[model samples]
Target: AQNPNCNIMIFHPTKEEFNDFDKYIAYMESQGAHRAGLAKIIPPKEWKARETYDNISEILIATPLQQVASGRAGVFTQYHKKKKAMTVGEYRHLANSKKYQTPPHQNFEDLERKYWKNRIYNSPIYGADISGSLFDENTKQWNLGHLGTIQDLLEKECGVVIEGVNTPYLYFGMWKTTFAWHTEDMDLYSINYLHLGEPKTWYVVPPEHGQRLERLARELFPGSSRGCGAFLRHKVALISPTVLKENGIPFNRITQEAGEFMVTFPYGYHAGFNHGFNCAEAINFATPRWIDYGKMASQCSCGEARVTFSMDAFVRILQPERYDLWKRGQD
Candidate 1:
């Protein structure tokens, strides 16, 4: 697919614009149908309003990278469900503890980077099929890459190009996701919004500068690899438009005091800092399969490299009822 170039227009609104924005949100929720995040609407501290968040407040969309968790904790009180809450440290420890038999953190960086390489290969996150494993009084060990791989599905919808069947679709420790970046498969032109908390570090250099952004990142962060590229970001409010990519550049400022923005970026290569904060807590949406119903459109013509047919093929290969993976690999 031919790479296309586009623009990201910025719109800033003040309190005077709040009511107008609220009504606009209501109308769009009823009509437009795309999902939205509160970062764009409820300015700072008001995020607490989400403690009582409702479907009426514009349905929050989860990317293929996110899921809906209900019944397990606090989800819908209107439906009278109890909310289960855990601290970041508690959840992290639980996710990594022996009861859950969580895998090791291979020490990678940013957005779903947790599953990268062989670290997630048999890490249990991607290797096992837990479709029927749910039960009571028992622990649940996950294929963390479930959301990690699902996030890649959004790459197509985000309007990025795909090469050699899929790769280059970045997957970090199962949390946030971003492109290196590229164009969409279907070639649709649109602005992208990332509700980023570590939102800073970028300057837009003219497209003429080419791949210099990759070089810049290494120069800036030293010891930071090329894959761990750099962008010019400092304080949350500083906007530096001197970035070098032609498509999808990072915003110099934080649109949400809490970290979020609507972005229009360059086309070919977008270089910026990776999201590696293991501390980020996110995706408190209403359902677990939202990635399937919501962002699954991303893998249409691009092919699903993550959720593949080979899983069952390989799983079926393991059953002595079929072929045994153990003996099959032996003499």
Candidate 2:
């Protein structure tokens, strides 16, 4: 189901359709985020983000990476803001405040999510700490990207709690909250679902061209700092799709509306901008096919990431379950 131009796939499924555990599992582990470099799932009906947190005061908040706003359209993601960080609740108040509701409002539109970091999964707004699997009253036993199976089988069965990238993160954004270009850690997969509110536009490059894009990025912003700086180099200087097009590197675009899920495959370079104020949840996951790369992710990131060991440990935990009932073409 991967698109020829960019390896992203879009699927429209009803709640009832996705409720079948096996069907959802097949989608996630196979042709969904696992196989396709990027995927989008649009449900037939609306999601319940507003209902979950009825008021702005109800949501838990985290501090941003910086405070001052950027005037440039897409450069904020390239480096740290170099200002004081504020909490999401504080930013919400700031957005609706008289100070932010003025002529410089355009500056607010171009700011990226890297400026602020709010972990929604760690929020008390959800009632409990639901990791691995977040239970929505409607969706019941929801396994985000089918990763809960691995988490549950590992912890409950093998007694090993691998706290790596599998934990979901909640993002709250206002205006141009940007998540700059980067691939997932250890060449893993990820799923981002907009719980509610405004849409977010995404730009993704297939794994095949990810390195080339990175090489081009290095040339564009030479001597860019490592860590968060290198992480957001694309954000500092926007990587225009036109530029990529001219360079013969294809990038796919999508507007992720509320209640939809956006999936990214291993080493799929992705970045995006939040259209306006919104809330989204994202998490990382891995499939069996990702094992080999997991063994060498540290070297891939030039020793920046050494968490590959956790991935290998999880394999031993989830190994038995995979053999028990892998995707059986059982009718």
Candidate 3:
């Protein structure tokens, strides 16, 4: 049983409330939903996700897997930075296969099967980019692109589409496949909708504790921390809840089921693993409140890798009238 106090807030919204995405989200934030770092919204039961399996069937990407038999934190870092390609069809087949279900450690001789199992854990179909791929344009209620906050703030203000930022990205996961602890790009709020399949578990740290978590991560992985102040952006580190609690950090745990949406607040640190085979789509968007975080994120270093979007350019476009005024104030 989940401890009532430690659980991330869960909301059940009517169809009307869900359709008014921005207003509803604003309401949630006003109610201190962001304090939890992450929140779960169970949409009306009648809502159905449009078809997407065939659209993403041939998409290929490299996926890294961790040994599930070992504890979640057993492997501090990924063994192979370089990975092998596996298509959605191929990955789904392996995930459903009996050979893949058997523990790799128990089947030492089946090296071939073990290899497939280990590699197929969290294969992301990421960056699909196509506007109509996941949701029909006419389906305003379900299409993330049509959501008020995205259209009003991000798209209208930024004047461009960025895959995984303004545009959506898809993720594929199987049992124990993990997404490392990290915040969204540019420290923007992120929304993930599970299209289908089993629930995915999430752990989140509130914005107030963001610095403490980063400090703890830096101490735990000195090499990576030394390499980049935003090393967590690399998505290679995973800290267990036990370690977090031991260090006195407050966190929330939640399981996002199919047809549900998970929203992460700005600067919120979140990570999770899939319960079984599932498909999810996520994208990042920003409210006016995100300006400060975006400015802070722009100045942070993530090694030599460039940011996906530009905060300077965005701020210029987003608040052109007060741009110089803001600059003067900062100066």
Candidate 4:
């Protein structure tokens, strides 16, 4: 049977653990690194990126990175980065050279089969994209520089063995695009770091009230457009104390050491920051189980969970009608 619960311990990266990236990769391999993807057990780290268009003609575009298309990470999900955006130059170069777009289609039935197959019959995040209506993801939103704080809040909210990191940077990986549109089964816990001269903005959306997220995402953000998605008066946070703030809107002065504070998301709202903005965040996404959200509800303080969506996770997330139908019929 599949592991019912994630050893949240994997999220904790100690100085020793990160001392050698190759060693860490080896350790991940030794543990039989399982793919968080809905279809595959361990999604390959070498994902296909799209072609950039310095000019519409110069650019050789590839298909979109559809987590939805692959049903792996099925719907859009968040990946993390341990480095602060300001300091993510190396990774940024690697990421910039690659494109995280949707997959190419070959046939209508094929697309349908792929979507239905990947659709989640379990886990709350399966269909959690609705929060996009209220929240928005911008560039540089995936920095996990504030992992300690995320663990702090998770321990406070879920009473779990949340870990801590003293490093200035952490990771949350990139997320899928507009594919997985629902929130997760369980809420997330985190302490955010913002004392750095610059700060990043975080977006949020409440469930039900933000049901029209897809529509807005489509209208404002056209195909393959992730981070700088459409607009909404969603709540954005930066120097604010998530531990103290009631909502993301009206972001006020954050009064905390390291400018780090706590936050818990019960709904599946999306969040990210822009490039060159004041950014650096630490976060932890702990779930009882992504599937079987019903069980997740029982584990939370509010009995329901809110989620933060990410373009990184949704890179693989896709919608047939929204996709370029031409791919479905291609040979």
Check candidate 3 and list the clashing pairs.
none
Ranking by lDDT: 3, 2, 4, 1
Candidate closest to the true structure, highest lDDT: 3
User: What TM-score, computed on C-alpha atoms, does each candidate reach?
Assistant: 0.26, 0.66, 0.75, 0.26
Give the 10-residue window scoring lowest on summed lDDT in candidate 1: 71-80
Q: What is the lDDT, from 0 to 100, of the residue 249 in candidate 1?
A: 39
Q: Please give, for residues 9-125, the per-residue lDDT of candidate 3 as tens digits.
A: 778888888677778888877767887789988878766567454566676645534333222332254332434567777877766666544244433224323432453443332
Candidate 4, which segments miss by more than 4 Å at Cα? 1-190, 218-258, 262-264, 274-279, 285-331
Question: Model 2: which ten-residue window has the lowest total lDDT?
Answer: 119-128
Model 3: lDDT of residue 315: 46
What would the per-residue lDDT of candidate 4 be over residues 119-219, giving only the tens digit for each residue?
A: 33212111111111110122122223322243443345456543333232222122121212323323232334432222233334433233344454344
The TM-score leader among the candidates is 3
Q: Please give the lDDT score at residue 179 for candidate 4.
A: 19
Which parts of model 2 have CA positions greater than 4 angstroms off?
20-22, 28-36, 46-50, 67-77, 81-89, 97-138, 141-165, 225-238, 296-331
